[PDB]
Design a protein around this motif. Structure first.
Motif, short mmCIF file in Angstrom:
data_model
loop_
_atom_site.label_atom_id
_atom_site.label_comp_id
_atom_site.label_asym_id
_atom_site.label_seq_id
_atom_site.Cartn_x
_atom_site.Cartn_y
_atom_site.Cartn_z
N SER D 2 0.94 -1.39 -0.02
CA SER D 2 -0.20 -0.32 0.46
C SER D 2 1.27 1.34 0.05
O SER D 2 1.03 1.80 -0.84
N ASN D 3 1.78 1.05 0.54
CA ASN D 3 3.01 2.53 0.67
C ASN D 3 3.79 2.49 -0.43
O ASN D 3 4.36 3.40 -0.62
N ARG D 5 3.58 1.87 -3.10
CA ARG D 5 2.40 2.23 -4.58
C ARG D 5 2.23 3.67 -4.08
O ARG D 5 3.06 4.47 -4.94
N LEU D 6 2.00 4.17 -3.10
CA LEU D 6 2.83 5.80 -3.06
C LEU D 6 3.96 6.13 -3.01
O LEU D 6 4.14 7.10 -4.36
N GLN D 8 6.97 4.84 -5.59
CA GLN D 8 7.14 4.21 -6.26
C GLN D 8 6.37 5.07 -7.48
O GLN D 8 7.15 5.75 -8.11
N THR D 9 4.87 5.36 -7.11
CA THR D 9 4.05 6.57 -7.78
C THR D 9 4.86 7.95 -7.45
O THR D 9 4.90 9.06 -8.75
N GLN D 10 5.66 8.29 -6.66
CA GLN D 10 6.08 9.75 -6.04
C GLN D 10 7.28 9.57 -6.71
O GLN D 10 7.54 10.42 -7.47
N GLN D 12 8.45 7.99 -9.54
CA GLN D 12 7.98 8.34 -10.94
C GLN D 12 7.98 9.74 -11.51
O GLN D 12 8.03 10.77 -12.37
N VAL D 13 6.52 10.64 -10.64
CA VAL D 13 6.33 11.81 -10.20
C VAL D 13 7.23 12.58 -10.51
O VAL D 13 7.86 13.51 -11.09
N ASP D 14 8.18 12.33 -9.32
CA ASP D 14 9.43 13.14 -9.06
C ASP D 14 10.74 13.28 -10.62
O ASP D 14 10.99 13.86 -11.45
N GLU D 15 10.80 11.93 -10.63
CA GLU D 15 11.54 12.07 -11.77
C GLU D 15 10.82 12.97 -13.21
O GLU D 15 11.49 13.35 -13.76
N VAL D 16 9.78 12.42 -13.71
CA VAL D 16 9.22 13.35 -15.08
C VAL D 16 9.17 14.90 -14.37
O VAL D 16 9.32 15.66 -14.93
N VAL D 17 9.38 14.85 -12.96
CA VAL D 17 9.20 17.34 -12.80
C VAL D 17 10.84 16.98 -12.55
O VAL D 17 11.23 18.47 -13.24
#
Ligand SMILES: [Ca+2]
Ligand SMILES: [Ca+2]
Ligand SMILES: [Ca+2]
Ligand SMILES: [Ca+2]
Ligand SMILES: [Ca+2]
Ligand SMILES: [Ca+2]
Lengths: 66, 63, 278, 63, 74
Positions: D2-3, D5-6, D8-10, D12-17
């Motif tokens: 559960s944590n 997923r958060l 991982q998604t985080q 990816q987000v920072d990477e794209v940032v």
């Protein structure tokens, strides 16, 4: 625990803030690309007019040595 | 609901990945077009020089 | 119109459950056989995909008497986002049970505080528009001078699941057709395991401006199967015999030369699309 | 998890940032070069017009 | 005591996280469309720049020819 759900919620909100930053970044990107696009259009106009003027001048110079 | 939450996390994650791919392709394209603008501007300087010199000679030939 | 339904509604705050009452319907249409209908009521909650409850079947009556009550195990806080759906059906032994008429009541508008009981005229329900297949966005760029057609496959969304137990393995194939003949076959890369694939792949074709109105471009989104012929998910087509948003995008491309125009398009079944090609 | 997923998604987000930030700066450089190319283009069509006029003069005079 | 309020606080933060995820989905979708439009515009401007370069080359050729003419007149 309230600590666990609130820290979970905290990570979630942080992810939302990061995603907001990415969003503003992407939209800004689109904006800049648009501006650059119109300016590029202007460049193209100047270039085409330049093509015309140059072409005319070349015809004239070629005809002048005849 | 926790289920809707986690599912939303998943969807968001995937879309974010899509954004990564888009970002990369975008970056490469921007770089290529940057090089292109450099070449075009160099050609622009060369043609500027040629036009100035030819025009100078032309006006000097007046008479 | 063409029918009324008397219903009761109440929430038991102790057991946290929803009480739905099916008493009697009135003014029912003379289907199927001449005279009186054979009615039965299926009641369910939305967006719940839960097991739909149904009342007893009543033999030959346009004014049926059910007097039956149903219970829905639903939290009160979650009830505000739900909607009670009552559907009246006509029983048919050798035919498909045609729906007489249904109606829906938003639960966030119901006062569960006092016992609710009301007559409501049945409404002619909407019909699902076939099945969702998905949308695909791409750009069209045409330069009449050089006769180059730039079709950049951008992306897609909400693609139907093919592979059993899995989402999809979508890829995009471009057919350039004319007079029912497949002339050019171009295809994109395969994006594995996704319902929202991204491509951004540019394609180019030779299209003289003399035949621009006689060419058809068929875009087909298919799913890749590891073994066997890859099943097709959907397809759309622009150009000649094009309709709606397709002819719209085509006309936009024609009205905007030397410029790419990005647009979304709703996928249609392979059968109908292949049929629309004369 | 559960944590997980958060996290991982985080990530990816920072990477794209990061990637998109770099792309934005590249678009800024692109913008500078496009400005310079715009000015050079206008000046170029100006000089081309003047050279066209001069060519007209020399043609009318020498032919 | 504050037990009830604690539970309702938990559900409140849960709902907050849920709507947060909703906002995330909306934002990433808008960002997505923005990026698509960005790419398309970059295609337009790119082909435009290609044409501009070709134009520059034609200009260079013509100007070279005119240069040859002036060198002939000289
Ligand atoms: Ca019947
Ligand atoms: Ca019947
Ligand atoms: Ca399949
Ligand atoms: Ca598959
Ligand atoms: Ca290019
Ligand atoms: Ca080139």
């Amino acid at each position: 625990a309230l600590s666990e759900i609130e820290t979970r919620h905290s990570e979630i909100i942080k992810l939302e803030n990061s995603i907001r930053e990415l969003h503003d970044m992407f939209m800004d990107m689109a904006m800049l690309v648009e501006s650059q696009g119109e300016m590029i259009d202007r460049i193209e106009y100047n270039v085409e007019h330049a093509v015309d003027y140059v072409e005319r001048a070349v015809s004239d110079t070629k005809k002048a040595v005849k | 609901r926790e289920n809707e939450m986690d599912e939303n996390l998943e969807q968001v994650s995937g879309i974010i990945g899509n954004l990564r791919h888009m970002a990369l392709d975008m970056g490469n394209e921007i770089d290529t077009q940057n090089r292109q603008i450099d070449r075009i501007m160099e050609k622009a300087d060369s043609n500027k020089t040629r036009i100035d010199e030819a025009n100078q000679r032309a006006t000097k030939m007046l008479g | 119109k063409l029918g009324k339904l008397q219903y009761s509604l109440d929430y038991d705050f102790q057991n946290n459950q929803l009480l739905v009452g099916i008493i009697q319907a009135a003014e029912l249409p003379a289907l199927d056989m001449g005279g009186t209908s054979d009615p039965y009521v299926k009641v369910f909650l939305l967006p719940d995909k839960k097991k739909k409850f149904e009342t007893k079947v009543h033999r030959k009556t346009l004014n049926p008497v059910f007097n039956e009550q149903f219970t829905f195990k639903v939290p009160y806080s979650e009830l505000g986002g739900k909607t009670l759906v009552m559907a009246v059906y006509d029983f048919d032994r050798f035919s498909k049970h045609d729906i007489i008429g249904e109606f829906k009541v938003p639960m966030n508008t119901v006062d569960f505080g006092h016992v609710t009981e009301e007559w409501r005229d049945l409404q002619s329900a909407e019909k699902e528009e076939q099945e969702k297949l998905g949308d695909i966005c791409f750009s069209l760029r045409y330069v009449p001078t050089a006769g180059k057609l730039t079709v950049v496959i951008l992306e897609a969304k909400n693609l139907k699941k093919m592979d059993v137990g899995g989402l999809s393995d979508p890829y995009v194939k471009i057919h350039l057709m004319q007079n029912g003949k497949r002339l050019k076959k171009k295809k994109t890369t395969i994006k594995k395991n996704t319902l929202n694939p991204y491509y951004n792949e540019s394609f180019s074709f030779e299209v003289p401006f003399e035949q621009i109105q006689k060419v058809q471009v068929v875009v087909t989104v298919l799913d890749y199967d590891k073994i066997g012929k890859n099943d097709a998910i959907g397809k759309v087509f622009v150009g000649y015999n094009s309709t709606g948003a397709e002819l719209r995008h085509w006309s936009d491309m024609l009205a905007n030369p030397r410029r790419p125009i990005a647009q979304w398009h709703t996928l249609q079944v392979e059968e109908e699309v292949d049929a629309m090609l004369a | 998890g559960s944590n997980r997923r958060l996290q991982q998604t985080q990530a990816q987000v920072d990477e794209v940032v990061d990637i998109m930030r770099v792309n934005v700066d590249k678009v800024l450089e692109r913008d500078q070069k496009l400005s310079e190319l715009d000015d050079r283009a206008d000046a170029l069509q100006a000089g081309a017009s003047q050279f066209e006029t001069s060519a007209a003069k020399l043609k009318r005079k020498y032919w | 005591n504050e037990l009830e309020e604690m539970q309702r606080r938990a559900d409140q933060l849960a709902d907050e996280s849920l709507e947060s995820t909703r906002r995330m989905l909306q934002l990433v979708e808008e960002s997505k469309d923005a990026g698509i439009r960005t790419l398309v515009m970059l295609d337009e401007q790119g082909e435009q720049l290609d044409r501009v370069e070709e134009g520059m080359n034609h200009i260079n050729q013509d100007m070279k020819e005119a240069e040859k003419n002036l060198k002939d007149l000289g």
